[PDB]
Design a binder for this molecule. Structure first.
Ligand SMILES: *[C@@H]1O[C@H](CO)[C@@H](O[C@@H]2O[C@H](CO)[C@@H](O[C@@H]3O[C@H](CO[C@H]4O[C@H](CO)[C@@H](O)[C@H](O)[C@@H]4O)[C@@H](O)[C@H](O[C@H]4O[C@H](CO)[C@@H](O)[C@H](O)[C@@H]4O)[C@@H]3O)[C@H](O)[C@H]2NC(C)=O)[C@H](O)[C@H]1NC(C)=O
Ligand SMILES: *[C@@H]1O[C@H](CO)[C@@H](O)[C@H](O)[C@H]1NC(C)=O
Lengths: 36, 48
């Protein structure tokens, strides 16, 4: 999923938004959730 | 929070400061003028 900060691999993009847990940057954050 | 549609602020005007829905960036009039006045460099948004 291309992003402003660069390129990520291994994760999955979602539309729902939450409070950031691990700031990736440029309005992008990572979180581990369900399945998991 | 968000501003209500009405502006019955005893005649006080905040137009230049309150966000303008028309502009994509909701920077106030004053803030947009400030950004224009400033001359930044190296935005870094995947620069060629
Ligand atoms: C809080 O502050 C704002 C900004 O002043 C007020 O919004 C209007 O602002 C104008 C002048 O700035 C007031 O005067 C008259 O406006 C009429 C039409 O208003 C709009 O016109 C265009 C629309 O794109 C805008 O440029 C303008 O800012 C208004 O949004 C016109 O009879 C005159 O405006 C003319 O101004 C210049 C030429 O001098 C050009 O933009 C146009 O040719 C335009 O026709 C006139 O100057 C107006 O009365 C203000 N109120 C309105 C439109 O409702 C807010 O009203 C004010 N709010 C409070 C509570 O004070
Ligand atoms: C939802 O996700 C997919 C792709 O991620 C796509 O429909 C669109 O980007 C998003 N639309 C909404 C309303 O979230």
């Amino acid at each position: 999923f291309q992003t402003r900060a660069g390129c990520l691999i291994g994760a999955e993009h979602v539309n729902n938004s939450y409070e950031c847990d691990i700031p990736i940057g440029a309005g992008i954050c990572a979180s581990y959730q369900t399945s998991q | 929070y968000k501003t209500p549609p009405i502006k019955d602020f005893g005649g006080f005007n905040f137009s230049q400061i309150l966000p303008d829905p028309s502009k994509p960036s909701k920077r106030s009039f004053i803030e947009d003028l400030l950004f224009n006045k400033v001359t930044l460099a190296d935005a870094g948004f995947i620069k060629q």
